[PDB]
Amino acid sequence: ADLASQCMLGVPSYAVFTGSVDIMQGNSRLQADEVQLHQKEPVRTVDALGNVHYDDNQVILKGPKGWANLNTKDTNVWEGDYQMVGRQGRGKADLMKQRGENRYTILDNGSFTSCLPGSDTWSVVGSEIIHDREEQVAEIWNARFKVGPVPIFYSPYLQLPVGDKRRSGFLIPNAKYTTTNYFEFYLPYYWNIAPNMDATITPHYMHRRGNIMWENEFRYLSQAGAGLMELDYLPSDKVYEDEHPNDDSSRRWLFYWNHSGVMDQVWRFNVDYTKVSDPSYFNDFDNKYGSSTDGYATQKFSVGYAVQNFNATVSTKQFQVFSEQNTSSYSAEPQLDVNYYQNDVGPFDTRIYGQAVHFVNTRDDMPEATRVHLEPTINLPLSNNWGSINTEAKLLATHYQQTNLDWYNSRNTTKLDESVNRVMPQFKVDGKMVFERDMEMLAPGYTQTLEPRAQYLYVPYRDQSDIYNYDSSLLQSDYSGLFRDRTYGGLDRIASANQVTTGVTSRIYDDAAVERFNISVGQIYYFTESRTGDDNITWENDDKTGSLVWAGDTYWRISERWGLRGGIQYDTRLDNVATSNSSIEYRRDEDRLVQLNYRYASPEYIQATLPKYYSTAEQYKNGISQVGAVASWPIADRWSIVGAYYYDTNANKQADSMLGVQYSSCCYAIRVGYERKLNGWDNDKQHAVYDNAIGFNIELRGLSSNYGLGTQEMLRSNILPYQNTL
Amino acid sequence: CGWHLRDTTQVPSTMKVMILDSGDPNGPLSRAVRNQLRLNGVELLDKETTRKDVPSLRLGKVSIAKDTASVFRNGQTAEYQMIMTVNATVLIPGRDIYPISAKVFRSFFDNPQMALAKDNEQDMIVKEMYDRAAEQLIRKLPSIRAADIRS
Amino acid sequence: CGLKGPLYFPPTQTQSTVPDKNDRATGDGPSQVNY
Ligand SMILES: *C[C@@H](COC(=O)CCCCCCCCCCCCCCC)OC(=O)CCCCCCCCCCCCCCC
């Protein structure tokens, strides 16, 4: 059974008399021996003596001597021990008092541990522990926190938050050791501003940097959506000064803001903003909001309005590139996208897409542009049970205004123009069929389907060498992207097309009509070469026409716990497999999984599609060949091991490795983690740089409902985080 | 050799008239699902309708995640993998509620020298992932009808 | 001594278009640790 219900069965669940007394008043019992009842003016008093057992639905009190008042509901148990009923918590005090309509449980020289009976892992002895049920807090005076029989620290006023209600105060600290910062210590303070907002201040002390970094978080919840701000500030850095002695100030900082929400169902607001002081911020400091694997920082704002058949958006897109080999970066400031849809215009469907963007560069020598795009579309869909054919026509009309071209036009043979018009139509036909057959030799009730697809695309040729390329990048051709009508993203390069795509998919369904297997193959056949007028890709072959692109996909759901995925791309102009990937996983539940995966990218693919210095730089030129393993398994129902190992078969060196162990008892939890990762490149010795990190977390349990085993936090904490592929 | 054209429809005959219900009715997944059902000749009704005998399709939580899938020899990102997960339920008027799901995987290479261009490529990829997830949910409708007959 | 927890308004979901880049899966629940 799970930990939450394993820690539950441990806890309890719901006029002298001179004899064995069992007096009950609705819910409260009293199994005392001698009870002395008085009604002096009435002021009704109960004086219990001998093995007093004040059983209840909330507490179990045991004591040699007792006392109670039936008017003000004031009790007194001498030299006793209590125990919560229906919840976790127990202790022992020299005097237990219930006051204020059974609100305060006051203990004199008492203790409190939320550990199960017979276990004494930790305790907190005070002298005036008070449990307040309106505030859900346990105030302790002259507190001494004890582990086993040995105290570890003393401090007055050591409140313990009981329950799940939020409170403002110090959180339990955590520590690390990394090779970049040495020993590190975080001491968080949580501020509970309001139900829909809160803040957290964390002094993060790094031994090697010789100063404290201040981390400030602010979360909010509004009508316009939910957000999060982060502002870290390190006033001075000792390591950074040595590497950069010329800089007058060595401050390091990070600003982060993320917003997302929809208001009144028609207004969509988004923010994704990151700014850092220097390129090497994430190679030194570990954040949840950035990774050492980043290449730049994204700074985007967006405001949109969407209805059933229309939407408009205004946005800005800016980027902060880290590498010193890149100094020019374009931005959209601003961009406007408008879509309008109208169906059932006869048998046709119509659509319009317009845009207006302004491009600015960080450099002051680069071209600057304004572009307006219009794109009306009309299609005629036809369908029946076993097939569908969709014929489409489109017009692509663009206008440019390019300024600041003096510096570019001087050092390039072909010149950019100041005013460009580009009008080109596009015609496409897309077909589909489905076949079926009863596949009974596999298992009774199964079926198999065969779904061949074809498409024809034609776009004429326009010479676009007088337009600078601001926002067009080459798109991948996987099986899904074989039937795409574009070769580039954006609108600066629109290649010609005279081609036919053919593909086929097969699926296997079982008797419950649930899909088990699917496999896909396809190709693109070119009747003429695709040219934008500015063609400088580095192909290994001088092939222009014919069957040049191939792709495939697979997915087999072997069981409810097994899964297999695959995908391969082949390009004849590379004379090699462009990219490939594979993955197999067994996953019983969240705490039991094994996964193997492989990723490939050829050296020729890196040369063709990525910058020109990638094909000559040692850390880029070989492509990708990576084997990974991820595992997670519990031992003895309390321990939980998580591991990951990624290996580069080209260099015969690892990329990443991780190992985490957590022990989660019924009254505490301890986690220790380790990770070694690639963290830069040494340009003098031409070898990679690694970073090691060990983290230690501790936690108290039994006071709130939290009983997590920490598996998902550990599985997602490395540079190549775990993705569920089942 | 045993093959024949698909004689039965894609969407079950029971779900020829449906109610499309969503907490973000003007969002990208609702537009993708509504267009996909319109291709299959399904008549969609408003949530606040007088009909009390039509199945209701409810669109739930949608998650999109972009993670590092592979790295170069300096630790920098080489490939990003995007995963889209969609949850939904189909309520038959009188029977139980049948949940369905979708999951779409895509990947692409990163280029810090053309970061604006790679931003537009990612926006294009997400639109396609919304079309695929809308198809996967509709291919699960015959599985719900089969479970209905069993119960 | 403080407890950190989920936010709520003082007394299905939206289909986004921006993915969560490298989410660290730090769960949002009542805890005395930072997460
Ligand atoms: C208000 C508290 C929040 O924490 C609490 O709820 C109170 C209990 C404190 C939890 C301690 C858990 C860590 C110690 C366990 C033993 C070490 C590990 C054992 C082997 C694996 O605020 C806090 O954040 C807690 C206090 C901060 C940490 C305390 C560290 C020691 C402090 C020593 C200073 C005392 C100096 C004066 C007395 C000598």
Numbering used by the authors:
A (entry chain A): 25 to 38, 67 to 93, 100 to 784
B (entry chain B): 19 to 169
C (entry chain C): 20A, 21 to 30, 44 to 67
Q: Which sentences from the paper describe this structure?
A:
Several copies of LptA link LptBCFG to LptDE in the OM, forming a protein bridge spanning the periplasmic space that functions as an ATP hydrolysis-driven conveyor belt for LPS molecules. Once they arrive at the LptDE complex, the LPS molecules are inserted into the outer leaflet of the OM via a process for which the details are not clear, but which must involve a separation of the first (S1) and last (S26) β-strands of the LptD barrel at the front of the complex to allow the translocating LPS molecule to move laterally into the OM from the lumen of the LptDE complex.
The Cryo-EM Structure of SfLptDE Contains Bound LptM. We obtained a complex of SfLptE with wild type E. coli LptD following expression of the Sfimp4213 variant of SfLptDE (SfLptD lacking residues 330 to 352 in extracellular loop 4). Parts of all three acyl chains of the N-terminal lipid anchor are visible, protruding into the DDM micelle via the LptD intramembrane hole previously identified, supporting the notion that LptM mimics LPS. The LptM region between Gln45 and Asn54 interacts extensively with LptE, analogous to the proposed interaction of LptE with translocating LPS.
